[PDB]
Amino acid sequence: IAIPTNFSISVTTEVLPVSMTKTSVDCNMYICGDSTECSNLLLQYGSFCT
């Protein structure tokens, strides 16, 4: 049999993510912008952006 006669104390560092960044988007100024000619056309595509 093998039995230790001494010992050592070690400190271990481990990392793991918890959260990401929160983001938000606006369809009416991404798809069109300030163009009111295509705001009414984007209105005809339903409720994807909701």
Added chain:
Amino acid sequence: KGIYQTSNFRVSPSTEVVRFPNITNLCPFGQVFNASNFPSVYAWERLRI
């Protein structure tokens, strides 16, 4: 109750602003439409306007 992200409804454009170059002369439609003796099709001519 809560917090909500709202879209644009407050501000709408009304004023039309237009800027154009200072070109003033009338463009020669007379010498290219009311002319005489246009060439035939195999010897057509270019005109830079």
